[PDB]
Short mmCIF file of all heavy atoms in Angstrom, two decimals:
data_model
loop_
_atom_site.label_atom_id
_atom_site.label_comp_id
_atom_site.label_asym_id
_atom_site.label_seq_id
_atom_site.Cartn_x
_atom_site.Cartn_y
_atom_site.Cartn_z
N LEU A 43 0.83 -1.20 0.00
CA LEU A 43 0.00 0.00 0.00
C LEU A 43 0.87 1.26 0.00
O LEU A 43 0.49 2.24 -0.63
CB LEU A 43 -1.01 0.00 1.17
CG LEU A 43 -1.92 -1.25 1.33
CD1 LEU A 43 -2.86 -1.08 2.50
CD2 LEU A 43 -2.76 -1.50 0.08
N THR A 44 2.05 1.22 0.64
CA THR A 44 2.96 2.38 0.64
C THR A 44 3.60 2.60 -0.74
O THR A 44 3.74 3.75 -1.17
CB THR A 44 4.05 2.22 1.69
OG1 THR A 44 4.79 1.03 1.40
CG2 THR A 44 3.51 2.19 3.08
N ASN A 45 4.00 1.51 -1.44
CA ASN A 45 4.62 1.61 -2.76
C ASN A 45 3.57 1.57 -3.88
O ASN A 45 3.91 1.78 -5.04
CB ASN A 45 5.67 0.51 -2.97
CG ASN A 45 6.77 0.51 -1.93
OD1 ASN A 45 7.12 -0.53 -1.36
ND2 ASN A 45 7.33 1.68 -1.66
N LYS A 46 2.29 1.34 -3.51
CA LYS A 46 1.11 1.25 -4.39
C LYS A 46 1.39 0.22 -5.49
O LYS A 46 1.18 0.48 -6.67
CB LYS A 46 0.75 2.64 -4.98
CG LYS A 46 0.49 3.73 -3.93
CD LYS A 46 -0.93 3.71 -3.38
CE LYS A 46 -1.24 4.89 -2.48
NZ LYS A 46 -0.70 4.71 -1.10
N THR A 47 1.92 -0.95 -5.10
CA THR A 47 2.31 -1.97 -6.07
C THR A 47 1.63 -3.28 -5.78
O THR A 47 1.69 -3.77 -4.65
CB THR A 47 3.83 -2.11 -6.08
OG1 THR A 47 4.39 -0.82 -6.31
CG2 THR A 47 4.35 -3.09 -7.14
N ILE A 48 0.97 -3.85 -6.80
CA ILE A 48 0.35 -5.16 -6.72
C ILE A 48 1.36 -6.15 -7.27
O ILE A 48 1.86 -5.96 -8.37
CB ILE A 48 -1.02 -5.24 -7.45
CG1 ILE A 48 -2.05 -4.28 -6.81
CG2 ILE A 48 -1.54 -6.70 -7.48
CD1 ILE A 48 -3.30 -4.08 -7.58
N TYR A 49 1.70 -7.18 -6.47
CA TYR A 49 2.62 -8.23 -6.86
C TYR A 49 1.82 -9.48 -7.22
O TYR A 49 1.00 -9.93 -6.41
CB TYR A 49 3.66 -8.51 -5.75
CG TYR A 49 4.49 -7.30 -5.37
CD1 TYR A 49 4.11 -6.48 -4.31
CD2 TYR A 49 5.65 -6.97 -6.06
CE1 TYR A 49 4.86 -5.36 -3.95
CE2 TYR A 49 6.42 -5.85 -5.71
CZ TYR A 49 6.02 -5.06 -4.65
OH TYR A 49 6.75 -3.94 -4.29
N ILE A 50 1.99 -10.00 -8.45
CA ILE A 50 1.31 -11.22 -8.90
C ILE A 50 2.35 -12.33 -9.06
O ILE A 50 3.42 -12.09 -9.64
CB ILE A 50 0.44 -11.02 -10.17
CG1 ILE A 50 -0.62 -9.93 -9.93
CG2 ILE A 50 -0.23 -12.36 -10.60
CD1 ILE A 50 -1.29 -9.40 -11.19
N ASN A 51 2.04 -13.52 -8.52
CA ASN A 51 2.92 -14.69 -8.55
C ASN A 51 3.20 -15.14 -9.99
O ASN A 51 2.28 -15.54 -10.71
CB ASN A 51 2.35 -15.83 -7.71
CG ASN A 51 3.35 -16.89 -7.34
OD1 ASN A 51 4.38 -17.10 -8.01
ND2 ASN A 51 3.06 -17.60 -6.28
N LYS A 52 4.48 -15.05 -10.39
CA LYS A 52 4.97 -15.41 -11.73
C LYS A 52 4.68 -16.88 -12.08
O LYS A 52 4.41 -17.18 -13.24
CB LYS A 52 6.48 -15.13 -11.82
CG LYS A 52 7.04 -15.05 -13.23
CD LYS A 52 8.55 -14.92 -13.22
CE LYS A 52 9.17 -15.08 -14.59
NZ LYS A 52 8.96 -13.88 -15.46
N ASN A 53 4.75 -17.77 -11.09
CA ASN A 53 4.53 -19.21 -11.30
C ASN A 53 3.05 -19.56 -11.56
O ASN A 53 2.79 -20.55 -12.24
CB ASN A 53 5.06 -20.00 -10.09
CG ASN A 53 6.44 -19.59 -9.63
OD1 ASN A 53 7.40 -19.52 -10.41
ND2 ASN A 53 6.58 -19.31 -8.34
N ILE A 54 2.11 -18.74 -11.05
CA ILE A 54 0.65 -18.92 -11.15
C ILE A 54 0.05 -18.16 -12.35
O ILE A 54 -0.92 -18.62 -12.95
CB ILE A 54 -0.04 -18.46 -9.81
CG1 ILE A 54 0.58 -19.12 -8.53
CG2 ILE A 54 -1.57 -18.61 -9.82
CD1 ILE A 54 0.32 -20.61 -8.28
N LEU A 55 0.58 -16.95 -12.64
CA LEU A 55 0.09 -16.06 -13.70
C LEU A 55 -0.27 -16.77 -15.04
O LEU A 55 -1.38 -16.53 -15.50
CB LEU A 55 1.05 -14.89 -13.97
CG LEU A 55 0.60 -13.89 -15.06
CD1 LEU A 55 -0.73 -13.19 -14.70
CD2 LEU A 55 1.69 -12.90 -15.37
N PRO A 56 0.58 -17.63 -15.66
CA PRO A 56 0.17 -18.26 -16.95
C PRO A 56 -1.16 -19.01 -16.93
O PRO A 56 -1.83 -19.10 -17.96
CB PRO A 56 1.30 -19.25 -17.24
CG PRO A 56 2.47 -18.70 -16.53
CD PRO A 56 1.95 -18.06 -15.29
N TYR A 57 -1.56 -19.54 -15.76
CA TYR A 57 -2.76 -20.36 -15.56
C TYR A 57 -4.01 -19.57 -15.16
O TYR A 57 -5.04 -20.19 -14.93
CB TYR A 57 -2.47 -21.42 -14.48
CG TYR A 57 -1.20 -22.20 -14.73
CD1 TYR A 57 -0.02 -21.88 -14.06
CD2 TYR A 57 -1.15 -23.22 -15.68
CE1 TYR A 57 1.16 -22.57 -14.31
CE2 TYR A 57 0.03 -23.92 -15.93
CZ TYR A 57 1.18 -23.60 -15.24
OH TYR A 57 2.35 -24.28 -15.49
N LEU A 58 -3.95 -18.23 -15.08
CA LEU A 58 -5.12 -17.46 -14.65
C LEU A 58 -6.01 -17.05 -15.82
O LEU A 58 -5.49 -16.67 -16.86
CB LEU A 58 -4.71 -16.20 -13.85
CG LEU A 58 -3.87 -16.43 -12.59
CD1 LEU A 58 -3.35 -15.12 -12.04
CD2 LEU A 58 -4.63 -17.20 -11.54
N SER A 59 -7.35 -17.14 -15.63
CA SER A 59 -8.33 -16.71 -16.65
C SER A 59 -8.63 -15.21 -16.46
O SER A 59 -8.16 -14.62 -15.47
CB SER A 59 -9.60 -17.55 -16.56
OG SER A 59 -10.30 -17.35 -15.34
N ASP A 60 -9.38 -14.59 -17.39
CA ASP A 60 -9.74 -13.17 -17.34
C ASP A 60 -10.52 -12.83 -16.05
O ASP A 60 -10.16 -11.89 -15.36
CB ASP A 60 -10.56 -12.80 -18.59
CG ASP A 60 -11.00 -11.36 -18.66
OD1 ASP A 60 -10.20 -10.51 -19.11
OD2 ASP A 60 -12.15 -11.07 -18.27
N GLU A 61 -11.55 -13.65 -15.71
CA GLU A 61 -12.36 -13.48 -14.50
C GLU A 61 -11.49 -13.52 -13.22
O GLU A 61 -11.70 -12.69 -12.35
CB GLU A 61 -13.47 -14.55 -14.43
CG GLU A 61 -14.49 -14.27 -13.34
CD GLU A 61 -15.72 -15.16 -13.28
OE1 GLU A 61 -15.59 -16.39 -13.48
OE2 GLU A 61 -16.81 -14.63 -12.95
N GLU A 62 -10.53 -14.49 -13.13
CA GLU A 62 -9.60 -14.68 -12.00
C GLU A 62 -8.66 -13.48 -11.83
O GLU A 62 -8.48 -13.02 -10.70
CB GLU A 62 -8.77 -15.97 -12.15
CG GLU A 62 -9.56 -17.24 -11.85
CD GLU A 62 -9.06 -18.53 -12.49
OE1 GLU A 62 -8.05 -18.51 -13.22
OE2 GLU A 62 -9.69 -19.58 -12.23
N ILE A 63 -8.07 -12.97 -12.93
CA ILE A 63 -7.19 -11.79 -12.87
C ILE A 63 -8.00 -10.58 -12.34
O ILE A 63 -7.53 -9.88 -11.44
CB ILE A 63 -6.52 -11.50 -14.23
CG1 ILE A 63 -5.58 -12.65 -14.63
CG2 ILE A 63 -5.76 -10.17 -14.20
CD1 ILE A 63 -5.38 -12.83 -16.17
N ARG A 64 -9.22 -10.37 -12.88
CA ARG A 64 -10.14 -9.30 -12.49
C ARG A 64 -10.51 -9.41 -11.01
O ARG A 64 -10.44 -8.40 -10.31
CB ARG A 64 -11.41 -9.33 -13.36
CG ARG A 64 -11.20 -8.79 -14.77
CD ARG A 64 -12.49 -8.67 -15.55
NE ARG A 64 -12.25 -8.59 -16.99
CZ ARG A 64 -12.08 -7.45 -17.67
NH1 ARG A 64 -12.14 -6.28 -17.05
NH2 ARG A 64 -11.86 -7.48 -18.98
N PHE A 65 -10.81 -10.64 -10.53
CA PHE A 65 -11.13 -10.88 -9.13
C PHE A 65 -9.92 -10.54 -8.23
O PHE A 65 -10.07 -9.82 -7.25
CB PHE A 65 -11.61 -12.33 -8.89
CG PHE A 65 -11.79 -12.64 -7.42
CD1 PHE A 65 -12.88 -12.12 -6.71
CD2 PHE A 65 -10.85 -13.38 -6.72
CE1 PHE A 65 -13.01 -12.34 -5.35
CE2 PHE A 65 -10.97 -13.59 -5.35
CZ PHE A 65 -12.06 -13.08 -4.67
N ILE A 66 -8.73 -11.05 -8.58
CA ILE A 66 -7.48 -10.85 -7.85
C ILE A 66 -7.11 -9.34 -7.77
O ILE A 66 -6.73 -8.87 -6.70
CB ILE A 66 -6.36 -11.69 -8.53
CG1 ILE A 66 -6.46 -13.17 -8.06
CG2 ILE A 66 -4.96 -11.12 -8.25
CD1 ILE A 66 -5.87 -14.21 -9.00
N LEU A 67 -7.25 -8.60 -8.88
CA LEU A 67 -6.93 -7.17 -8.91
C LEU A 67 -7.91 -6.36 -8.08
O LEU A 67 -7.47 -5.48 -7.34
CB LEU A 67 -6.85 -6.63 -10.35
CG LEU A 67 -5.69 -7.15 -11.21
CD1 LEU A 67 -5.73 -6.53 -12.60
CD2 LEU A 67 -4.33 -6.93 -10.54
N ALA A 68 -9.23 -6.69 -8.15
CA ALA A 68 -10.25 -6.01 -7.34
C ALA A 68 -10.03 -6.27 -5.84
O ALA A 68 -10.18 -5.35 -5.04
CB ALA A 68 -11.65 -6.44 -7.75
N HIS A 69 -9.62 -7.50 -5.47
CA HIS A 69 -9.36 -7.87 -4.08
C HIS A 69 -8.19 -7.08 -3.50
O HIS A 69 -8.25 -6.65 -2.34
CB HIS A 69 -9.08 -9.39 -3.93
CG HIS A 69 -9.15 -9.85 -2.50
ND1 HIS A 69 -8.11 -9.62 -1.60
CD2 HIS A 69 -10.17 -10.44 -1.83
CE1 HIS A 69 -8.53 -10.10 -0.44
NE2 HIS A 69 -9.77 -10.59 -0.52
N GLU A 70 -7.13 -6.90 -4.28
CA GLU A 70 -5.94 -6.20 -3.83
C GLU A 70 -6.13 -4.69 -3.79
O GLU A 70 -5.71 -4.06 -2.82
CB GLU A 70 -4.74 -6.60 -4.69
CG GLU A 70 -4.35 -8.06 -4.47
CD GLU A 70 -4.42 -8.51 -3.02
OE1 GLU A 70 -3.45 -8.23 -2.27
OE2 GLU A 70 -5.48 -9.04 -2.62
N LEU A 71 -6.82 -4.13 -4.78
CA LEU A 71 -7.09 -2.69 -4.84
C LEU A 71 -8.06 -2.26 -3.73
O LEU A 71 -7.95 -1.14 -3.26
CB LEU A 71 -7.65 -2.29 -6.21
CG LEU A 71 -6.66 -2.24 -7.38
CD1 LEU A 71 -7.38 -2.06 -8.70
CD2 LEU A 71 -5.63 -1.13 -7.20
N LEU A 72 -8.96 -3.15 -3.29
CA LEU A 72 -9.91 -2.85 -2.21
C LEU A 72 -9.20 -2.64 -0.84
O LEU A 72 -9.80 -2.03 0.04
CB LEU A 72 -11.03 -3.90 -2.10
CG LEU A 72 -12.27 -3.69 -2.98
CD1 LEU A 72 -13.15 -4.94 -3.00
CD2 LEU A 72 -13.08 -2.43 -2.55
N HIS A 73 -7.93 -3.09 -0.69
CA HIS A 73 -7.13 -2.83 0.53
C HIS A 73 -6.72 -1.37 0.61
O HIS A 73 -6.31 -0.90 1.67
CB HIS A 73 -5.88 -3.72 0.59
CG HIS A 73 -6.21 -5.17 0.64
ND1 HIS A 73 -7.06 -5.68 1.60
CD2 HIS A 73 -5.81 -6.17 -0.16
CE1 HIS A 73 -7.17 -6.96 1.34
NE2 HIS A 73 -6.46 -7.29 0.26
N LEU A 74 -6.83 -0.64 -0.52
CA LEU A 74 -6.56 0.80 -0.57
C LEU A 74 -7.78 1.59 -0.12
O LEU A 74 -7.67 2.77 0.22
CB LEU A 74 -6.14 1.22 -1.99
CG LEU A 74 -4.73 0.84 -2.40
CD1 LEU A 74 -4.58 0.90 -3.92
CD2 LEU A 74 -3.71 1.75 -1.74
N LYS A 75 -8.94 0.94 -0.14
CA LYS A 75 -10.22 1.54 0.22
C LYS A 75 -10.61 1.22 1.65
O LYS A 75 -10.90 2.13 2.43
CB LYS A 75 -11.31 1.02 -0.74
CG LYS A 75 -11.83 2.04 -1.72
CD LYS A 75 -13.21 2.52 -1.35
CE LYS A 75 -14.09 2.66 -2.57
NZ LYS A 75 -15.48 3.02 -2.21
N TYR A 76 -10.68 -0.08 2.00
CA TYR A 76 -11.17 -0.54 3.30
C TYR A 76 -10.22 -1.51 3.98
O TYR A 76 -9.79 -2.47 3.35
CB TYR A 76 -12.54 -1.22 3.13
CG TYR A 76 -13.57 -0.39 2.41
CD1 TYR A 76 -14.02 -0.74 1.14
CD2 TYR A 76 -14.14 0.73 3.01
CE1 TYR A 76 -15.02 -0.01 0.50
CE2 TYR A 76 -15.11 1.49 2.37
CZ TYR A 76 -15.57 1.10 1.12
OH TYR A 76 -16.53 1.85 0.49
N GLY A 77 -9.96 -1.27 5.26
CA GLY A 77 -9.11 -2.13 6.08
C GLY A 77 -9.90 -2.99 7.04
O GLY A 77 -11.12 -3.12 6.91
#
């Protein structure tokens, strides 16, 4: 949250679908909104 950087696992990334990436990004960005 201090560096405003989302880190995605390189070993898992090739196997993620569009819906999964969207879910993962929304989950991480929501930590900037609500704790």
Side-chain angles (χ1 to χ4, degrees):
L43 307 181
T44 59
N45 302 132
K46 304 276 187 280
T47 306
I48 297 169
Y49 302 94
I50 302 166
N51 197 336
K52 197 186 170 75
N53 313 308
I54 308 289
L55 180 62
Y57 310 100
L58 302 171
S59 65
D60 180 84
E61 191 173 41
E62 285 156 0
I63 296 153
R64 285 187 199 269
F65 174 74
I66 280 156
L67 292 180
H69 195 282
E70 292 320 279
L71 285 171
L72 273 168
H73 298 306
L74 285 162
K75 251 254 221 175
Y76 306 112

